[PDB]
Amino acid sequence: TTDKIGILNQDQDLKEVRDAVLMVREHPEMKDKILEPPIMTVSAINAQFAAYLAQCVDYNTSKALTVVDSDSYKLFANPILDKFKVNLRELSSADTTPPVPAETVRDLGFEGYLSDFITGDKRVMKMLCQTSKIHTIPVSRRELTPAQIKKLITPRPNGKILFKRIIHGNRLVDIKQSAYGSKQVFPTDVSIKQTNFYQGSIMSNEQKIRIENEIINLKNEYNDRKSTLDALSNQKSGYRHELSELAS
Amino acid sequence: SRSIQNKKVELQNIAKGNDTFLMNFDRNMDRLLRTIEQRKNEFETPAIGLGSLVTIRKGFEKWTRSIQRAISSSLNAFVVSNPKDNRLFRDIMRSCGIRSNIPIVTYCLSQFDYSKGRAHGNYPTIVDALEFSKPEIECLFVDLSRIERIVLIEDKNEARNFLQRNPVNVNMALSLRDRRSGFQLSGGYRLDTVTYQDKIRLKVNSSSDNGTQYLKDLIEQETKELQNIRDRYEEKLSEVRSRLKEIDGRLKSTKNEMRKTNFRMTELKMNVGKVVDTGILNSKINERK
Predict the structure, then answer these.
(1) Which of A6, A126, A149, A236 has its CA 20 to 30 A from that of A143?
(2) CA distance A89 to A36
(3) Of A56, A62, A116, the residue nearest A89 (C-alpha)
(4) Pairing of strands B203-204, B190-195
C-alpha cells in the first residue's frame, strides 16, 4: 500500500522507473521540473477510490514521469530514454474544466468526479484529467439502478451523449455512440479489478480474513521460528563461553 | 519456460483439450456450447457470439498477437439482444461453471455501411486483416473496437510519422516490435508498450502442420533472443564470479592471518613459560655480596 520507494520492488519492470525517479531526486534541477509519477504523488482518499483510478489510468501513465513545461523535453528528455525505457508525459495547456458542473452530476446519483476523490500534486493530477479524462467521469460508491443507467445511455436531443464513461458502485460502463447508421448506442460494462461487489459484509470469510496476508503471516511465523533457533544457538554458545570462563 | 511452453502450446493437445491455445479457462467451453445449442429453444435470439467467429486473414499472421491484444475486450463477448436473454445467459454460465469473467455487450444485429469512416492510406487495416463469418459480427466489431480506423505499420517510426501527419479517420496504429510485445501508438505522441497475451483467442486459416510450423520457428528464435539475454548477463555473471573469487581469496588470507596469530600465541606461551621457572640460583651472588 505504501506509495513510496518501496512500491518499486513489487514488479521487475518497475526497476527502470525506480532508477529514473532516483536520478530525478539526485538532480536538484530535475525534481522541480519533473515530478514523481502519479503512483507516488496522486493518492486516493481510501482503498475503494484507489482501485477506481487504477482502472481508468493505464499502467504506463501511472509510472510515467511528468514534464511541466516543453522546454525541458527538448534537451533533458534524451538522457532519460537512452538508459531507461520509461514513458514520458508532457503537461499541455488543454482546459481541464468538465462540460457539466458537479450539481447536475449529483442529481444523477453520483457523489462526484474522480479528480475530487484523489489528493496529490496539482501538476501531476492535471494530466490525469487530460490523458485519462477522469474529470469527465462521475464516480459513485453506490451501485445505481439499471433504469438510471439506461437513462444515461439515452443521449441528449442535440446528438451528443451526456457522459462517455460512468462509474456506479464498482461496475464500470463505457458509453459509446455509433457515428454511422442510425446512431445506435450500446453499453460496455467492465468489472474493476477488486474482490467483489460487497457492501460492508464479512468480506468473503471462507477460512480467514485474507488470502495473501495469511501467506505473509506464515512466512513471518517461519522467520520467528528461525529467530528462536538463532536465539537458542547463541544461548548454547554463551553457555559454552561460560564453561570456558570456568576453565580459565 | 513460458517461451518453452510457447513452443509446446502448438503441438501438445491442440484442438481436443488444449487449455492454453483454445480453452482459455476450465473445461467448460464445450459444455456451455452444447448447453446453448440444446437450450436455444427458450432464447429469442441466438447467443452464438466472438473469438471463434473471427479468423485472421492470410498474409498477416504476425499481426494476430497485436489484433488479440487490441480487441481482447470483444474477443470474449457474446451476442444478446434482450435483457431477459442477458439474465438467461448469465444464469446458464453460472450453472455450467465458468470461472473466467465473460463480459457481455448488448446489441441489435443489423448491417450498415462504414466505408466512409475507414482508414485513409496505403496501409492495410484490421478489416482487411480479419475474416468474419457473418456481416453482423463484423459490424459489431466495427462499432465496438473501431477496427476500421486502425492501420497496420511494421515500422515504429513510420507509424509515428503517419499518426503525426494527422490522418483522416484514424485514431491509433499498431506496430510490431517483437513476437512478445507490441508498440501501440495513438496520436503520434503517446507511445505505449503492450505485452502480447500468451493464450491466443483468434482462429487461423492455415493448418497447424505447414502454415503454422513456419511461425513455430519464429518462436524458437524468441528463445534465442532470451538466450541472448541470459548470455548477456553471463558477462555480468563473470563480474560476480570474480567478486566471489576475491571474497574467497580474502577468506583464505584471513585464515592465514588466524594461523599466524595462533603461531604468535604459541611463541608467546613458549616465551613466558620459562620466566621464573628455575633461574633463581642466587647462592653465588649471595656469597659474592
Answers:
(1) A126
(2) 11
(3) A62
(4) unpaired
Contacts with A32 (C-beta within 8 Å, 6 or more apart), sequence order: none
CB-nearest partner of B192 from A60, A181, A186: A60
**Residue B132 CB coordination number (10 Å):** 18
Q: Which residues of A touch B107 (CB under 8 A)?
A: 184, 186
Angle at B51 between CA A173 and CA A55, to 5 degrees: 30
Q: Residue A180 is nearest to which of B101, B116, B190, comparing CB atoms? A: B116
In chain B, the N- to C-terminal Cα span, in Å, equals 97
**Residue labelled with grid coordinates 608467546:** B268
Cα(B76)–Cα(B202) distance, rounded to whole angstroms? 10
Approach to solving:
cryo-EM
Query: Across the A/B interface, how many CB contacts are shorter than 8 Å?
Result: 44
Rounded CA-CA distance A203/A196 in Å is 9
Distance of CA A243 to the CA centre of its chain: 59
Return the closest-CA partner of residue B203 out of B22, B17, B82.
B22
Contact B112 A180 (CB under 8 A): yes
3-state secondary structure of B203: strand
Alpha-carbon B2 to chain mean position = 9
Interchain pair A58, B192: CB under 8 A: yes
Beta bridge partners of B175: B183
The owner of cell 570456558 is A244
B204 forms bridges with which residues in the sheet? B56
CB of B112 less than 8 A from some CB of A: yes
> Which one of A60, A180, A190 has the shortest CB-CB distance to B113?
A180
Q: Decide the pairing of beta strands B172-175 and B150-152.
A: parallel
